[PDB]
RNA sequence: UAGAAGCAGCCAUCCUUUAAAGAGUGCGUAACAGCUCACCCGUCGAGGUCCGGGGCCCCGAAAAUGGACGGGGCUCAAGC
RNA sequence: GAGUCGUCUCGGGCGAGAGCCCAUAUCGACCCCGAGGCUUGCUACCUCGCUGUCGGCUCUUCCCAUCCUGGCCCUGCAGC
C-alpha cells in the first residue's frame, strides 16, 4: 500500500504470466473466493489487489509490445469488486475452471435472479410433512411416492429479471439446489494480443455437437 | 463539607505549614500513582490548568477515581500509567454556625471565627499539570475521554485543554 | 495597470500568545494593505493595531497566490 | 464557506420547459400547466442566459449557497412536475377495522378509523387529484411540494400517540414518495 | 442463540437421560438406544464435558450420523503435551508449551479438517489455539 | 405489521436529554445540547 | 451590476464630478477607477462612492492604461464629459 | 459457567492466507444462529476529510402592584 | 425591611453504578457549577419624640419552578 511499491509488485507479476484476467471477486464469499484463491495457487496462478492500481495494465503494456491496457483496448472490462487473476491456464480452461469450482450459491430471498432457475424432477429423499405443502405453494407440483416427497416434473420456477420471493428461495435452499454463481464471474481475459470476453469463453462443447 | 465557594479562588492566603499550627486535618487521598512504571511508554498527555484555583482534597479523590476507574476497566492495569501529581497542602478554615434559632445565635461574628480545619487543598495556577497520564498511540482515545471527565470537577475551568506534550 | 496580491507576513500578540498570520490582499500600494490588515485582524481577533506586528509585506504576482481561497478569487481580476 | 467571485451556479433547462423571469419571481411552464414561486432572499437575482437559467449573487457566504441550491432544486422539481407530474402512492393499513377511504369533494374523508363514529378530513390542494383504488390510494398532481403536503395532511389526521405505538398502527402511511421510505 | 435443534451437548462418556435425549431425540430410524451406543464409545474420557455435536435426522429413514464438535485441536494438544485439563488462566499460567516438532504433527492430520495451506500455515493455525487458556 | 407504519412510528431514535423524536441516523440532537442520542421507542423484538 | 468597461460617473471622489471607468475590479469590496487626465481623472480606489453605471459600455482590456482605455472611451465619445 | 459458542464478566489479544478479516461495532438468544460493521475493489468523476486556537452570536437562563437600554424606538443601525 | 445567601428551595453539568440484557424508561453515589430569596443564620444600613406582635378572620392583587383542567413528548406506553 505504497504507490509504485504496490503497482510495481503487480507490475512484475503481469509480465510474469501469459494470461491475465479480471474477475469479479465481489459476488462471493470468502468461502468461495478464499478457497478459490488457494485453488488458483495449486493451479498455477495467483489473484491480486489494487485500487486505481488495478487499471495500470497500462504500465505493463507500455513496458511491452501489446494491446491489453486501457489505451489500445476496447473498454476496460473492470467492474466493482473485481480482482486480477494471473495464470499459466489457458483462458477457456480458466473460465471452465472458475465455473466448476465454487461451492455453491443459493438464490437469496428478494433478489433479482440472474438467469432462469429450474428444478429437476425426482425424489427429494425427504419424508412426508409440511414440506409438500410448501412445494405446492411455490409453484412446484409434488406428491408422495415411495414414501418420500417427489417433484412431479422439471419446471422453470422463476424467469430471469424476476425477483425471487422469500418462500421460493428457502425451499430451493432446503432442496440443496443452487442455480446462482458465487464462484468468480469472469469480466474478461487477455492472452497474447487478444481479449476474450465471457460470452466467447463460455463454450458448451456438447451444445455445438447437439446444434449440428 | 460545605459546597466549594472558597475553593475556586487564590486571592485567599496561605495557612499551610501543618507543623506550625495546632490542629491539622487528615487526608482522603491515599493513592496517587497507579498502573505500570512510567518508563514503559513514550507519549504524554496532560490536562493543563488555565485558571487559578484551589482544588479540594475531596475533588482530587473523586475526579481521579472516576477517571481511573474508566481506564482500569477498559484498558486494564497492564497498560497506561496515570499520575495526579499534586498533594493538597493549603488548610481550610470555618466559622462555626448551625441551626439553633430563637434566642440563640449560631452565629457569631467573632469570639474565635478562626478556623477549625475542614480540609486541605492544592493550589493550581496557569499552565500546571493537573493530570499526566502516559500512554501509547493505541491507547490515545481513552486518555482524552478520561481528561474531559476530569475538567468538569475542576473548580473553575480549563482553556488550555487536553494537551499533547508530545512526550519530549 | 498594477494590481498585485500582497503577501503580508506577521504576528500578533493576544493574551501573551503568538498568532501567525499570512494575509494576502490585493491593492496597488502597501498603504492599502496596511490599513486593510490592521482593520481585518483588529475587528475579528478583537485586538488593537498597536499589538499587531508586521514582519513583512511582499508583493507576489496576481496570477498566483499561496492560498487556494485567494488564488481562486484573484483569477477573475 | 466555499469561496468563488461569481458566485454562480447554473440550471439546465430542457426544450420541454421554458422559464420566464421577472426580477426575483419565477414562472415555469411546460406542456402541462404552470407553477409560480417567489424566490426570496437578499441579493440573489435569477435571470435567463440563453437556454440556461443562472442563479447568482456577487458575494459568497455560507447562508447564501444553501438557499441558492434550494432554488435550483425547486426548479428541478418543476421540470419533472410540469412535464408529466409527480405520483406518491400511499397505503391505508388497519389493525382491526375495515376502514373506508373515499374522496368526497375537495376533501378526502377517512371513516371508521378505530371504530370512530366521527369523520376525519384533511385538505386537498387546487393542483392535486386524489384517486383511491381498493386500499391503495395514489396522490397525483403537477407539483411535488403540493403533493407532498396533501399526502402528509392525510397522515397527520390519522395521527395516534394517545395509546401505545406498537399495538395500534391504524392509519394511512407513505409507502412511496418517489423512492420507497424506509427501513427501520 | 443457540437453537435447541439437532445440535445439543452431552457430557463425556454417558448416555440416556430422558430429558436431553428423549426430547432432542437421536433417531436411527429406531429410537435412541443406537445413538446411546455410539455417543459414549467415541467420547470415552474419565470425566464429562459439554461436547458440541450435531445429528442429522429428518423424520424419514430417520438414520443418524453425527459429528464430534470436539476432537478438533483442543484435545489434540492434550495427548502431545500430556496434560488433560486446560489452564484455568491464559498467559498468566502456561501449564505447558509444546515443542515445535509436536506442533507439526498436530497440523499434518488436521489438514483435511482445516483449510491449512502449506505445513507452516497449519501450525500457525494450531499455535494460535495453543496460547489461549482461560 | 412492520414496514411502512413502523418506520415513521417505530424506527427513529429519541433524545436522551429532551425526549425529542429525531431521525433514525442523525449524529447530533435538534435542540437540546450535542448529545449522542439513543435508539428507539422499541418493545417489539 | 458593475462589470469592466462599463462607463461610470460618481458624485464623490476627487473633484467631484466626475465621469470615470472601471478598469479593474480590485476585490469584491473595492474597484479601481481611472480615466483620462483630460477630464482631470487620475487613478484611485473606490468602494462605492455612489458609483452608478451609465448606459454606455465600451471594450477595454482586463488591466489596462489610458491610451487603450483612452482609445475606446474616445470612439464612444465621452472624453469630453 | 447451565451456556458465555465475537456479543455477563476476566485475561491473553496471538498466528496463517489476502478484495478484505477486529480472538470483533450494535442489534439479536440469557448463551450455536440470523441482520450488520469497520474493510475493500468499485461506479458517479471532485477539491477533499481531520483535528486545534480565536472573535462574535445561540442554549444553559424561572419570580412575585409596571415590564422597561433614561425613554422612544433602532437590525448593511441609532448596534458591536 | 434592605444587604448577604453558610442554610433553605430549585435548577444544570459529569456520570461511578442498578434497571432482565441495556448509564441516561426509571433510579443515581463522588464531585463540580448556577438561579431565587420562600426557612434559618450573618449584618447593623434604616427606625428606639411608639413604621403596633403572631395566629385567625375578612377583603383584594400578583408570581410560576403547575396540583387539576386544556394541548403535548418519552416510557420497562397492552388496556384501564
From Swiss-Prot, chain B:
One of its GO terms (molecular function) is structural constituent of ribosome. Gene3D superfamilies: Ribosomal protein L10e/L16 (3.90.1170.10). The keyword Coiled coil does not apply. GO terms for cellular component: ribonucleoprotein complex; ribosome. It holds the Pfam family Ribosomal_L16. One of its GO terms (biological process) is translation. Keywords: Ribonucleoprotein, Ribosomal protein. Belongs to the universal ribosomal protein uL16 family. Part of the 50S ribosomal subunit. This is Large ribosomal subunit protein uL16.
Curated annotation (Swiss-Prot), chain C:
GO terms for cellular component: ribonucleoprotein complex; ribosome. It comes from the Archaea. Gene3D superfamilies: 3.10.20.10. InterPro entries: Ribosomal_eL20, Ribosomal_eL20_dom. GO terms for molecular function: large ribosomal subunit rRNA binding; structural constituent of ribosome. Pfam families: Ribosomal_L18A (PF01775). One of its GO terms (biological process) is translation. The keyword Ribosomal protein applies. Part of the 50S ribosomal subunit. Binds 23S rRNA. This is Large ribosomal subunit protein eL20. It comes from Pyrococcus furiosus (strain ATCC 43587 / DSM 3638 / JCM 8422 / Vc1). The gene is rpl18a.
Swiss-Prot record, chain F:
GO terms for molecular function: structural constituent of ribosome. InterPro entries: Ribosomal_eL40_arc (IPR023657), Ribosomal_eL40_dom (IPR001975), Ribosomal_eL40_sf (IPR038587), Ribosomal_zn-bd (IPR011332). GO terms for cellular component: ribonucleoprotein complex; ribosome. SUPFAM superfamilies: Zn-binding ribosomal proteins (SSF57829). The keyword Ribosomal protein applies. GO terms for biological process: translation. PANTHER family: 50S RIBOSOMAL PROTEIN L40E (PTHR39649), LARGE RIBOSOMAL SUBUNIT PROTEIN EL40 (PTHR39649:SF1). Part of the 50S ribosomal subunit. This is Large ribosomal subunit protein eL40. It comes from Pyrococcus furiosus (strain ATCC 43587 / DSM 3638 / JCM 8422 / Vc1).
Swiss-Prot record, chain G:
Keywords: Ribonucleoprotein, Ribosomal protein. May be present in 2 copies per 70S ribosome. Part of the 50S ribosomal subunit, where it binds 23S rRNA at its canonical site near helices 25 and 41, as well as a possible second 50S binding site near helix 58. InterPro entries: KOW, Rib_uL2_dom2, Ribosomal_eL14, Ribosomal_eL14_arc, Ribosomal_eL14_KOW, Translation_prot_SH3-like_sf. SUPFAM superfamilies: Translation proteins SH3-like domain. Belongs to the eukaryotic ribosomal protein eL14 family. Pfam families: KOW. This is Large ribosomal subunit protein eL14. It comes from the Archaea. One of its GO terms (biological process) is translation. One of its GO terms (cellular component) is cytosolic large ribosomal subunit. GO terms for molecular function: RNA binding; structural constituent of ribosome. It comes from Pyrococcus furiosus (strain ATCC 43587 / DSM 3638 / JCM 8422 / Vc1). The lineage of its organism: Archaea, Methanobacteriati, Methanobacteriota, Thermococci, Thermococcales.
Amino acid at each position: 500500500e505504497w504507490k509504485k511499491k504496490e503497482v510495481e509488485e503487480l507490475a512484475n507479476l503481469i509480465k510474469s504470466y501469459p494470461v491475465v484476467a479480471l474477475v469479479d471477486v465481489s459476488s462471493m464469499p470468502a468461502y468461495p473466493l478464499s478457497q478459490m484463491r488457494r485453488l488458483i495457487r495449486e493451479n498455477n496462478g495467483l489473484l491480486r489487489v489494487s485500487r486505481n492500481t488495478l487499471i495500470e495494465l497500462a504500465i505493463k503494456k507500455v513496458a511491452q509490445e501489446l494491446g491489453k491496457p486501457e489505451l489500445e483496448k476496447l473498454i476496460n472490462y473492470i467492474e466493482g469488486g473485481a480482482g486480477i487473476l494471473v495464470t499459466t491456464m489457458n483462458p477457456f480452461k480458466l473460465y471452465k475452471f472458475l465455473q466448476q469450482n465454487r461451492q455453491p450459491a443459493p438464490a437469496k430471498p428478494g433478489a433479482k435472479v440472474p438467469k432462469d432457475v429450474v428444478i429437476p424432477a425426482g425424489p427429494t429423499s425427504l419424508a412426508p410433512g409440511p414440506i409438500v405443502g410448501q412445494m405446492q405453494a411455490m409453484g412446484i407440483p409434488a406428491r408422495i411416492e415411495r414414501g418420500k416427497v417427489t417433484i412431479q416434473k422439471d419446471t422453470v420456477v422463476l424467469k430471469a429479471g424476476e425477483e425471487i420471493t422469500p418462500e421460493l428461495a428457502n425451499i430451493l435452499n432446503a432442496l440443496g439446489i443452487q442455480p446462482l454463481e458465487v464462484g468468480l464471474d469472469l469480466l474478461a481475459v487477455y492472452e497474447d494480443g487478444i481479449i476474450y470476453t465471457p460470452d466467447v469463453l463460455a463454450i458448451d462443447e456438447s451444445e455445438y455437437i447437439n446444434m449440428l | 463539607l460545605r459546597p466549594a465557594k472558597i475553593d475556586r479562588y487564590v486571592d485567599k492566603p496561605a495557612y499551610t505549614r501543618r507543623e506550625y499550627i495546632r490542629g491539622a486535618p487528615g487526608p482522603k487521598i491515599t493513592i496517587f500513582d497507579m498502573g505500570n512504571p512510567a518508563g514503559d511508554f513514550e507519549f504524554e498527555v496532560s490536562l493543563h490548568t488555565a485558571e487559578p484555583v484551589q482544588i479540594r482534597q475531596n475533588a482530587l479523590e473523586a475526579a481521579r477515581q472516576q477517571v481511573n476507574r474508566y481506564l482500569q476497566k477498559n484498558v486494564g492495569r497492564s497498560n497506561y500509567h496515570f499520575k495526579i501529581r499534586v498533594y493538597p497542602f493549603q488548610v481550610l478554615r470555618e466559622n462555626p454556625m448551625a441551626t439553633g434559632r430563637k434566642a440563640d445565635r449560631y452565629g457569631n461574628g467573632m469570639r474565635r471565627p478562626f478556623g477549625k480545619p475542614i480540609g486541605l487543598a492544592a493550589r493550581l495556577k496557569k499552565d500546571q499539570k493537573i493530570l499526566s497520564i502516559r500512554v501509547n498511540r493505541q491507547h490515545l482515545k481513552f486518555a482524552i475521554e478520561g481528561a474531559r471527565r476530569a475538567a468538569m470537577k475542576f473548580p473553575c475551568k480549563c482553556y488550555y485543554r487536553i494537551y499533547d506534550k508530545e512526550g519530549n | 495597470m498594477k494590481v498585485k496580491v500582497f503577501r503580508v507576513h506577521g504576528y500578533f500578540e493576544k493574551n501573551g500568545r503568538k498568532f501567525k498570520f499570512t494575509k494576502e490582499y490585493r491593492g496597488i500600494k502597501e498603504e492599502d494593505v496596511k490599513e486593510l490588515v490592521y482593520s481585518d485582524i483588529g475587528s475579528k481577533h478583537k485586538v488593537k493595531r498597536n499589538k499587531i506586528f508586521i514582519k513583512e509585506i511582499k508583493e507576489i504576482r496576481p496570477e498566483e497566490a499561496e492560498d487556494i481561497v485567494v488564488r481562486r478569487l484573484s483569477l477573475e481580476l | 464557506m466555499p469561496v468563488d467571485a461569481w458566485i454562480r451556479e447554473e440550471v439546465e433547462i430542457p426544450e420541454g420547459v421554458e422559464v420566464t423571469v421577472e426580477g426575483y419571481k419565477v414562472k415555469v411552464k411546460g406542456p402541462k400547466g404552470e407553477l409560480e414561486r417567489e424566490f426570496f432572499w437578499p441579493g440573489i437575482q435569477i435571470f435567463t442566459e440563453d437556454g440556461n437559467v443562472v442563479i447568482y449573487k456577487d458575494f459568497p457566504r455560507r447562508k447564501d449557497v444553501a438557499i441558492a441550491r434550494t432554488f435550483a432544486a425547486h426548479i428541478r422539481n418543476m421540470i419533472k412536475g410540469v412535464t408529466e407530474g409527480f405520483t406518491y402512492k400511499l397505503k391505508v393499513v388497519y389493525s382491526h377495522f375495515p376502514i373506508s377511504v373515499k374522496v368526497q369533494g375537495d376533501e378526502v374523508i377517512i371513516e371508521n378509523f378505530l371504530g370512530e363514529k366521527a369523520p376525519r378530513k384533511a385538505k386537498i390542494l387546487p393542483g392535486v387529484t386524489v384517486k383511491v383504488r381498493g386500499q391503495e390510494i395514489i396522490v397525483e398532481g403537477i407539483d411535488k411540494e403540493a403533493v407532498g403536503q396533501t399526502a402528509a395532511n392525510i397522515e397527520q389526521a390519522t395521527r395516534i400517540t394517545k395509546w401505545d405505538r406498537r399495538i395500534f398502527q391504524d392509519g394511512i402511511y407513505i409507502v412511496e414518495k418517489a423512492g420507497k421510505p424506509i427501513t427501520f | 442463540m443457540p437453537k435447541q435443534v439437532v445440535e445439543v451437548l452431552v457430557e463425556g462418556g454417558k448416555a440416556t437421560p430422558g430429558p436431553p435425549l428423549g426430547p432432542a431425540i437421536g433417531p436411527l430410524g429406531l429410537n435412541v438406544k443406537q445413538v446411546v451406543d455410539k455417543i459414549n464409545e467415541a467420547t470415552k474420557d474419565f470425566a464429562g464435558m459439554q461436547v458440541p455435536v450435531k445429528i442429522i435426522v429428518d423424520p424419514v429413514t430417520k438414520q443418524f450420523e453425527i459429528e464430534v464438535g470436539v476432537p478438533p485441536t483442543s484435545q489434540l494438544i492434550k495427548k502431545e503435551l500430556g496434560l488433560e485439563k486446560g489452564s484455568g488462566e491464559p498467559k498468566h499460567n502456561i501449564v505447558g508449551n509444546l515443542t515445535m516438532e509436536q506442533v507439526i504433527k498436530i497440523a499434518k492430520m488436521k489438514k483435511d479438517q482445516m483449510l491449512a495451506l502449506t505445513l507452516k500455515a497449519a501450525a500457525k493455525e494450531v499455535i494460535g489455539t495453543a496460547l489461549s487458556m482461560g | 405489521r412492520f414496514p411502512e407504519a413502523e418506520a415513521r412510528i417505530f424506527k427513529k431514535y429519541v433524545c436522551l436529554r429532551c425526549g425529542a423524536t429525531n431521525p433514525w441516523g442523525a449524529k447530533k440532537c435538534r435542540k437540546c445540547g450535542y448529545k449522542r442520542l439513543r435508539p428507539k421507542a422499541k418493545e417489539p423484538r | 451590476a458593475i462589470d469592466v468597461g462599463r462607463i461610470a460617473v460618481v458624485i464623490a471622489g476627487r473633484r467631484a464630478g466626475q465621469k470615470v471607468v472601471v478598469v479593474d475590479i480590485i476585490d469584491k469590496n473595492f474597484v479601481l477607477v481611472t480615466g483620462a487626465g483630460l477630464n482631470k481623472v487620475k487613478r484611485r480606489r473606490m468602494n462605492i462612492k455612489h458609483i452608478e453605471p451609465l448606459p454606455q459600455k465600451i471594450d477595454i482590456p482586463r488591466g489596462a492604461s489610458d491610451e487603450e482605455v483612452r482609445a475606446a472611451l474616445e470612439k464612444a465619445g465621452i472624453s469630453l464629459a
